[PDB]
Design a protein around this ligand. Structure first.
Ligand SMILES: [Mg+2]
Ligand SMILES: [Mg+2]
Ligand SMILES: [Mg+2]
Ligand SMILES: [Mg+2]
Ligand SMILES: [Mg+2]
Ligand SMILES: [Mg+2]
Ligand SMILES: [Mg+2]
Ligand SMILES: [Mg+2]
Ligand SMILES: [Mg+2]
Ligand SMILES: [Mg+2]
Ligand SMILES: [Mg+2]
Ligand SMILES: [Mg+2]
Ligand SMILES: [Mg+2]
Ligand SMILES: [Mg+2]
Ligand SMILES: [Mg+2]
Ligand SMILES: [Mg+2]
Ligand SMILES: [Mg+2]
Ligand SMILES: [Mg+2]
Ligand SMILES: [Mg+2]
Ligand SMILES: [Mg+2]
Ligand SMILES: [Mg+2]
Ligand SMILES: [Mg+2]
Ligand SMILES: [Mg+2]
Ligand SMILES: [Mg+2]
Ligand SMILES: [Mg+2]
Ligand SMILES: [Mg+2]
Ligand SMILES: [Mg+2]
Ligand SMILES: [Mg+2]
Ligand SMILES: [Mg+2]
Ligand SMILES: [Mg+2]
Ligand SMILES: [Mg+2]
Ligand SMILES: [Mg+2]
Ligand SMILES: [Mg+2]
Ligand SMILES: [Mg+2]
Lengths: 80, 145, 70, 60, 63, 143, 141, 55, 206, 67
RNA sequence: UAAUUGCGAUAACGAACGAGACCUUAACCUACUAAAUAGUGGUGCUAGCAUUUGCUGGUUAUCCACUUCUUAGAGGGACUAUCGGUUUCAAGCCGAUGGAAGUUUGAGGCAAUAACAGGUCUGUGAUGCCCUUAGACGUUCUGGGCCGCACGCGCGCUACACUGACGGAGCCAGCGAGUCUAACCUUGGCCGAGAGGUCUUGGUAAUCUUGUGAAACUCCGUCGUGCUGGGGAUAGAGCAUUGUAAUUAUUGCUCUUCAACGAGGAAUUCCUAGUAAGCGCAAGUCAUCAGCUUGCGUUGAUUACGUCCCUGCCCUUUGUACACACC
C-alpha cells in the first residue's frame, strides 16, 4: 500500500492519436452510425487536428454476408 | 621393427575353439573370427597371455595359443574385470560368463526362448520377426526377411 | 590373403639384389614389386636404411621416398 | 542483445519464414568517492524513466 | 603437323543458343596482314592467343 | 644460453620425457592400464600398451607447466575428441577422469606438480627444474 | 624505457599483437621461438617477412607476438601481418623515412597483405538453408 | 491375451510378406474439388440494397 | 651467403635459401619456361613463392584468376570430392611430396614438369552442342587459352584421383605419375587421352 | 548498378544553378560546401549529392550541359 | 539502373506514395571522454633457468602512470574519390591508383496500390451462426493411444575409407544463458573403467561457470588395401542418470553381436567470396530426450561476372461476345 501511485492526464489533442481515433471509430459504428460517415468524419477530424496525413481501413462484414474492406485516406503518408 | 626370418616354423591356417583362424593376419584380429571375441576382448586376452601382438597369427608357439584359449574361457580367474564380459549375472546361476564360439549361438537361442516361453512382449515380438527395441516400423527395413 | 605377409628367405635376398635401379622406393613401390605388404614393407624401409642403399629424401606418414645409394 | 526467433505464421502453412526480435540492453558504471549528503542529493534527483539506477557501497 | 597461331584483336559477342560461345577476329602471328573470325569455347579478352587447329575455314552464326 | 621447454617443439619434447619417465622406473601405473580405454569416446585402447601412461604423464606435465593451474575436468575436456555415435552425428566427448586424476596423483607423488590454491594443480618448482632440464637435453641431441 | 612500438595483425577473427622494442634480436610467438609455429607447412609464411627484407634488420630489435582468436591458418596470417606491420611501425618512429618506405616497398611489392588487413568475413546464414547462399531442398510434389 | 497373440498364426511377418499389396497404397493425392473454388455453392447471392446499406 | 644471428636463431638452409634466391618448398623458379606460346600469361611462374598457400582474392574479378600462381592452382584443384573440400593443408603437403617424387624421376625442376603437363593437356579445339534443329550436330570450336589451362588442371588432378582411388599407390605418387606421363605426352595418362579425344571429335565434326 | 536517383541529380542541378562560383571539380571541398550551404539529413545522401554535383561541374568546364 | 533508378526524346510542366533516403549490424580511427566488473608498461613481494645485463612465470590492490589492444558514448570517414578508357561524349559502364572500405560497401529491418473464397475458429476471456450442455462434446482421475507395420513419398543423419580410421601428443573461436522467496549456470577436493557419485564453492554476472583449452585441423606413431583396423544397422547381457512412473526398451556408460553400403538409373535441390563445402558450439524446445530449427564462429576452394536454350515471371502490341472477369 502506497508504494504504487496512479495519476490521470489529459492528452495534448486526441487528433494525432491512432489509439484514440480507432477507439472513436469503434464507438461511431457501435453507436450505430453510417460507415462512410464515421470513417470520413474521423479522417476529416484527424486532418483538421493538423496531421500530415491519415488512413482508415475497415475490414470485415457489414449487412451483406460476403466480407469487404475499404481504405479511407487523406493527406500524405510514407510507408517504408 | 626388424627384418625377420624363421623357417618352416609357422603353419598358415590354424584351428581353435572349433573354428578356423587364418595365419598371415596380425593375430589379435585372427582371434576375432571366433564368435564372441570383439577386437577389445582379443586385445586384452592377448596382453594377459603375454604375447607379442606385433606377431602374426602366423608365428606364435603352440603353448602360446594354449594359454590364449585358457584365458579366453576363464577370464574372471586371470583377472579380467567382468564388466568386460558379454554375459554377466546369468539369470539362473548368476555367475559371469564370457560365452564363446559355437556356444554364443546357443545362448542367443536360450534367451529368446526364455522370452517366448514366458509370453513376454519382447518374446512375441521376436517370434513375429519384427523389431523389438521399439523403433518405428512404418518406414524402415522393407528389404527385410 | 593374396600374399606378401612373411619374409621367405629367398624374398629377403630378393630385396637386397632388387633395390638398385629403384630411383623411387616407398611403401607403394615395395608392394608393386610383387611382394611385401605395407606392414613388413615398412620394416624393409627401416632396414635398408639399417645401412645402405636407400637415401632418405622425404619424411613421413603415408609418404616416404628414397633413391639409389652413392 | 536478447534475440527471440519465431515463425511469423500463427499456424503452419506457407514457406517457412522466420523472424527475429531484439531488446538491446545497455549497462554502465560510474565509481564515486563522496560523503552521504552528496550521494543522497545526487541520486534522489537525476531520476529518469527507463534508466535503472543502482547505488551500492563498500569494497567487497 | 601444322599449328597456326592467331592473336585476338576484336571481341565480337556471344553466339550459341545457350550463349557461351564468343565470336572473335584474330590476326594470325606468323604473317599478319590477314584476319579470320573464329568461335571460342572459353572466356576471352583482347590479345589472347588461339591455336587454330586448321588454318583456313571460318564460321558465323550458332544456334 | 639458458632454457625452458617453450624452446622445444611439442613432440620430440614429450617423447623425450616419455622415454625418461619410462627409464626412471619411479612412476605409479594404477594397474588397470592396458585393460582400459582413455575415453568412452574411443574404440580401441592405446597402441603403446606398456607405456602411454608415461606419454600422458609427460603431456599432462608439460601442459601444466605452460600455465597457472589446471584440474581433472579441463584435462578430460582436453584429452577428449569425437566419438562416432555410429550412424548419428559426431559430438565431442570428454575423456576419462580416472586416467588423468591418477596421472596427477602420480606426478605429484614424484613431486613434479602440486595441489594449487586457486584450484587444480600447479607445476612444481622441482617440476620446473626437471622439465627445463630434459628440454635442454632434447636440444642437446639436436646439436 | 627503450624504443618500442606495438602493432597487430588480423585474418578472419584472429588477432595477433606485436611488441617491437629495441633488443638483441629475439622473435618469439606467444611464448615460443618463431621457429616452432607448426601449422609447419605454413611455417615459411611467417618467416616470409624476414626473408623478403633481409634477416639482419631484426638485430637492433626484440620481437614478441601473441595471437588469440580465429583458428590455425587464421592465426598464421595474423601473426605474420603483425610482424611486418611491426617492423615498419618501428622504422617510422626511430629509423628514417626512406628506410621504412623501402621496407613497405619490398612487402607491398611481393605481398600477401602483410601491411593491410583482408576484409573478407563471415556472411550470415538466412532461414531456409544450412548456409548463407545455400537454400534447403525442394521436391515440388 | 499374450498366449493368444503368439499362438495365433495368421500373425507375424512372414504372413504379411506373403500377401499382395493393395493398389490404394501406391495411390495419388486425391484432390477432390478445386476448379469449383471460385464457384460459390451457397446458392444465396447478396443484393445491391443490402450491400449499399452496409457499405 | 653471409650468416647472421641474434637471440632466437634461424636454421642454416633456412637463412641460406631464404635471403638468397626466392625459391619454392626448395625448387627453382628461375629457368622454368612455358614450352607453348600463348599459355604464357595463363601459366604464372614468377612471382616466386615459398609454399602454395595464400589468402588470395583471385575470384572477385573476371580474369585475375589467371594471376594466381600455377602450382597453387594445382593444389587448389586437389582439394575436392566432398570429403576433402577445404583441407588445403592436406593438399599443399600432397604437392610438396608430389614435387619431391617427380624430381626423383628424370630430374627437371619438377615445377617445370608440372608446367609441361599443363601446357600439354589443354584442348586446342573442341565442340559444343549447337542446335541446328532437335537432332543437334556438333560445331567445332577453337577453345580459349584460359579454358585450356583450367581444363588441363581439372583433367590432370581428376585422372590422378580416380587412379589413386582404391589402391595402395598414394595420391602424390599417382598425381606425379599423371604429371610425368603427361609432361611429355604419352597416351598412358588419363589427361592426354582425354585431350587427344576431345580434339579427335572436334576434327571429326568440322 | 550505380545510377543516381532523382533527388540526388535534382539537387546537383539546383546547386550548380545557384552556387556555381564556389564549387570546383574537387569533391572534398564541394562536400563541405554542401554542408555550409544546404540542409541534408544523412552524411551518405549529402556525399552522393556533392560527388555528383562535382561530376556535373567537372564536365560543364568543357562545354555546357542541358538542364 | 537492382529500381517509373536516371539520361534523353517530348503537349507537356512540376510534384507526392512506393524504390531511394531512413534504421540496425559488420568493417576503419596511436584523434575525444574514461575504466579493480577490460587490459598494457614500471615498480615493489617472489619462483625457475642462466648467470654479464638476461629469459619465463607467480602475486583482483603493495603503489605509479597509461588507453595500443577490450568496452560504448560523442564525433570523423566514402561522395563509386583521382586519373584514364567507353558511351548519343548524357545518365552511366569499365580499368588503374589511392583507400578500413568502391558488387545498393557486405548483410539485414522497414516497405505503397491491388489481389487469393491461400492458411489459421486447435494462440487468445477475438468473434457470428450452428451444434452440445449432466448417460456432457463441460472437467477431472486411472490406463492405453498419437511410436502401431506387406509397402509408396519428402526433409534429414552416418557411410562406403589411405586428402583415411585408430592411438598418443599439439592446441585455437564466436553468438548465448544462468537460482527468490529458489534449487538455475557450476569451478575446485575426493571416490569411480565409464556413465556418474559426494563434499564444498563462485555467480542475480564484462566480476563466477568461462580463455566455455569446441570440432574439423596440426604433429609422431599403429594399420596397409583385405567388406580391412572402412562402416556401425540389428541384437544380448550388466551398470547409472531424469522422473510419481522408463514395459512398447527417455537419455548416459561397458562388454559383446559386425548388417547393408565397393560412389549410387530415370530424375532433382542449392550455390558466386570469408561465399560454397567441411567443422563444431550456444540459444529455442527442455524434468528427462536433437539426427530439428535459429544464430555463431573455425578451416576455406574450383567456376561464371555471361546469356535467353530450358523453366518461371513481369512488360508492350493484339483479340475478346469475358467484367462474379477463362474456376
Ligand atoms: Mg519515401
Ligand atoms: Mg569378434
Ligand atoms: Mg580438444
Ligand atoms: Mg587430442
Ligand atoms: Mg557459418
Ligand atoms: Mg526492386
Ligand atoms: Mg649487467
Ligand atoms: Mg642482472
Ligand atoms: Mg582505444
Ligand atoms: Mg587497390
Ligand atoms: Mg550499412
Ligand atoms: Mg481454400
Ligand atoms: Mg485465429
Ligand atoms: Mg467456436
Ligand atoms: Mg498458443
Ligand atoms: Mg487478440
Ligand atoms: Mg467438446
Ligand atoms: Mg505425430
Ligand atoms: Mg510425401
Ligand atoms: Mg521443409
Ligand atoms: Mg586424430
Ligand atoms: Mg568400480
Ligand atoms: Mg551461493
Ligand atoms: Mg571468448
Ligand atoms: Mg568390401
Ligand atoms: Mg570403426
Ligand atoms: Mg517404455
Ligand atoms: Mg506402441
Ligand atoms: Mg569389420
Ligand atoms: Mg558420388
Ligand atoms: Mg520425449
Ligand atoms: Mg540443446
Ligand atoms: Mg521441430
Ligand atoms: Mg475482331
Amino acid at each position: 500500500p502506497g508504494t504504487i501511485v496512479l495519476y490521470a492526464e489529459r492528452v495534448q489533442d486526441r487528433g494525432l492519436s491512432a489509439v484514440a481515433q480507432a477507439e472513436s471509430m469503434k464507438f461511431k459504428l457501435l453507436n450505430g452510425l453510417a460507415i462512410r460517415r464515421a470513417a470520413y468524419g474521423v479522417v476529416r477530424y484527424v486532418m483538421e487536428s493538423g496531421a500530415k496525413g491519415c488512413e482508415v481501413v475497415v475490414s470485415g462484414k457489414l449487412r451483406a454476408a460476403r466480407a469487404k474492406a475499404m481504405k479511407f485516406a487523406d493527406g500524405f503518408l510514407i510507408h517504408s | 621393427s626388424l627384418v625377420v626370418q624363421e623357417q618352416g616354423s609357422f603353419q598358415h591356417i590354424l584351428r581353435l575353439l572349433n573354428t578356423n583362424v587364418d595365419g598371415n593376419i596380425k593375430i589379435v584380429y585372427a582371434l576375432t573370427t571366433i564368435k564372441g571375441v570383439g577386437r577389445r576382448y582379443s586385445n586384452l586376452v592377448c596382453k594377459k597371455a603375454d604375447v607379442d601382438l606385433h606377431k602374426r597369427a602366423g608365428e606364435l608357439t603352440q603353448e602360446e595359443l594354449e594359454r590364449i584359449v585358457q584365458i579366453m574361457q576363464n577370464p574372471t580367474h586371470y583377472k579380467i574385470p567382468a564388466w568386460f564380459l558379454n554375459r554377466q549375472n546369468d539369470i539362473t546361476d548368476g555367475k559371469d560368463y564370457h560365452t564363446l564360439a559355437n556356444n554364443v549361438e546357443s545362448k542367443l537361442r536360450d534367451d529368446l526362448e526364455r522370452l517366448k516361453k514366458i509370453r513376454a512382449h519382447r518374446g512375441i515380438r521376436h517370434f513375429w520377426g519384427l523389431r523389438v527395441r521399439g523403433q518405428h516400423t512404418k518406414t524402415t527395413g522393407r528389404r527385410r526377411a | 590373403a593374396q600374399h606378401a605377409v612373411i619374409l621367405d628367405q629367398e624374398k629377403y635376398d630378393r630385396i637386397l639384389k632388387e633395390v638398385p635401379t629403384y630411383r623411387y622406393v616407398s611403401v607403394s613401390v615395395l608392394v608393386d614389386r610383387l611382394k611385401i605388404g605395407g606392414s613388413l614393407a615398412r620394416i624393409a624401409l627401416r632396414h635398408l636404411e639399417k645401412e645402405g642403399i636407400i637415401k632418405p629424401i622425404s619424411k613421413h606418414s603415408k609418404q616416404a621416398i628414397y633413391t639409389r645409394a652413392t | 542483445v536478447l534475440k527471440i526467433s519465431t515463425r511469423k505464421t500463427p499456424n503452419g502453412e506457407g514457406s517457412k519464414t522466420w523472424e527475429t526480435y531484439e531488446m538491446r540492453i545497455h549497462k554502465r558504471y560510474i565509481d564515486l568517492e563522496a560523503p552521504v549528503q552528496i550521494v543522497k542529493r545526487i541520486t534522489q534527483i537525476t531520476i529518469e524513466p527507463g534508466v535503472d539506477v543502482e547505488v551500492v557501497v563498500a569494497s567487497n | 603437323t601444322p599449328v597456326t597461331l592467331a592473336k585476338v584483336i576484336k571481341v565480337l559477342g556471344r553466339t550459341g543458343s545457350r550463349g557461351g560461345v564468343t565470336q572473335v577476329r584474330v590476326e594470325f602471328l606468323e604473317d599478319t596482314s590477314r584476319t579470320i573470325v573464329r568461335n571460342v569455347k572459353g572466356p576471352v579478352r583482347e590479345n589472347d592467343i588461339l591455336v587454330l587447329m586448321e588454318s583456313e575455314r571460318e564460321a558465323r552464326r550458332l544456334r | 644460453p639458458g632454457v625452458s621447454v617453450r624452446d622445444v617443439a611439442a613432440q620430440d619434447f614429450i617423447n623425450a620425457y616419455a622415454s625418461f619417465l619410462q627409464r626412471q622406473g619411479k612412476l605409479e601405473v594404477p594397474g588397470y592400464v592396458d585393460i582400459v580405454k582413455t575415453s568412452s569416446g574411443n574404440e580401441m585402447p592405446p597402441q603403446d600398451a606398456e607405456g602411454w601412461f608415461y606419454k600422458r604423464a609427460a603431456s599432462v606435465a608439460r601442459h601444466i607447466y605452460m600455465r597457472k593451474q589446471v584440474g581433472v575436468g579441463k584435462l578430460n575436456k582436453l584429452y577428449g575428441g569425437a566419438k562416432s555415435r555410429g550412424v548419428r552425428p559426431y559430438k565431442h566427448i570428454d575423456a576419462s577422469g580416472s586416467i588423468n586424476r591418477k596421472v596427477l596423483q602420480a606426478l605429484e607423488k614424484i613431486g613434479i606438480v602440486e595441489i594449487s590454491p586457486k584450484g587444480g594443480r600447479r607445476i612444481s618448482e622441482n617440476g620446473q627444474r626437471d622439465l627445463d632440464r630434459i628440454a635442454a637435453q632434447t636440444l642437446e641431441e639436436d646439436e | 624505457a627503450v624504443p618500442s612500438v606495438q602493432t597487430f595483425g588480423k585474418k578472419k577473427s584472429a588477432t595477433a599483437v606485436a611488441h617491437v622494442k629495441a633488443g638483441k634480436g629475439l622473435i618469439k610467438v606467444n611464448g615460443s621461438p618463431i621457429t616452432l609455429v607448426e601449422p609447419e607447412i605454413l611455417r615459411f609464411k611467417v618467416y616470409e617477412p624476414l626473408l623478403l627484407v633481409g634477416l639482419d634488420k631484426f638485430s637492433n630489435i626484440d620481437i614478441r607476438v601473441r595471437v588469440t582468436g580465429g583458428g590455425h591458418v587464421s592465426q598464421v596470417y595474423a601473426i605474420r601481418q603483425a610482424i611486418a606491420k611491426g617492423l615498419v611501425a618501428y622504422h617510422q618512429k626511430y629509423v628514417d623515412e626512406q628506410s621504412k618506405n623501402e621496407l613497405k616497398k619490398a612487402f607491398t611489392s611481393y605481398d600477401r597483405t602483410l601491411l593491410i588487413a583482408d576484409s573478407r568475413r563471415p556472411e550470415p546464414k538466412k532461414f531456409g538453408g544450412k548456409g548463407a547462399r545455400s537454400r534447403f531442398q525442394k521436391s515440388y510434389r | 491375451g499374450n498366449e493368444g497373440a503368439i499362438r495365433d498364426k495368421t500373425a507375424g511377418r512372414r504372413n504379411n510378406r506373403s500377401k499382395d499389396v493393395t493398389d490404394s497404397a501406391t495411390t495419388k493425392k486425391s484432390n477432390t474439388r478445386r476448379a469449383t473454388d471460385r464457384h460459390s455453392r451457397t446458392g444465396k447471392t447478396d443484393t445491391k440494397k443490402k450491400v449499399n446499406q452496409g457499405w | 651467403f653471409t650468416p647472421v644471428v641474434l637471440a632466437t636463431p634461424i636454421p642454416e638452409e633456412v637463412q641460406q635459401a631464404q635471403t638468397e634466391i626466392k625459391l619454392f618448398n626448395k625448387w627453382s623458379f628461375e629457368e622454368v619456361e612455358v614450352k607453348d606460346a600463348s599459355l604464357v600469361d595463363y601459366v604464372q611462374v614468377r612471382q616466386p613463392i615459398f609454399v602454395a598457400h595464400t589468402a588470395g582474392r583471385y575470384a572477385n574479378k573476371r580474369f585475375r584468376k589467371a594471376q594466381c600462381p600455377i602450382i597453387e592452382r594445382l593444389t587448389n584443384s586437389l582439394m575436392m570430392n566432398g570429403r576433402n573440400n577445404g583441407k588445403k593443408l592436406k593438399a599443399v603437403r600432397i604437392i610438396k611430396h608430389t614435387l619431391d617424387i617427380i624430381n626423383v624421376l628424370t630430374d627437371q625442376n619438377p615445377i617445370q614438369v608440372v608446367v609441361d603437363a599443363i601446357t600439354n593437356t589443354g584442348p586446342r579445339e573442341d565442340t559444343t552442342r549447337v542446335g541446328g534443329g532437335g537432332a543437334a550436330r556438333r560445331q567445332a570450336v577453337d577453345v580459349s587459352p584460359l579454358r585450356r589451362v583450367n581444363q588441363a588442371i581439372a583433367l590432370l588432378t581428376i585422372g590422378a584421383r580416380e587412379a589413386a582411388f582404391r589402391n595402395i599407390k598414394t595420391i602424390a605418387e599417382t598425381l606425379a605419375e599423371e604429371l610425368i606421363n603427361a609432361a611429355k605426352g604419352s597416351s598412358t595418362s588419363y589427361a592426354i587421352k582425354k585431350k587427344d579425344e576431345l580434339e579427335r571429335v572436334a576434327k571429326s565434326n568440322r | 548498378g550505380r545510377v543516381r536517383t532523382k533527388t540526388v541529380k535534382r539537387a546537383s542541378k539546383a546547386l550548380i544553378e545557384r552556387y556555381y562560383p564556389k564549387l570546383t571539380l574537387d569533391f572534398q571541398t564541394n562536400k563541405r560546401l554542401c554542408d555550409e550551404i544546404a540542409t541534408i539529413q544523412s552524411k551518405r545522401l549529402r556525399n552522393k549529392i556533392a560527388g555528383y554535383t562535382t561530376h556535373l561541374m567537372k564536365r560543364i568546364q568543357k562545354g555546357p550541359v542541358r538542364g
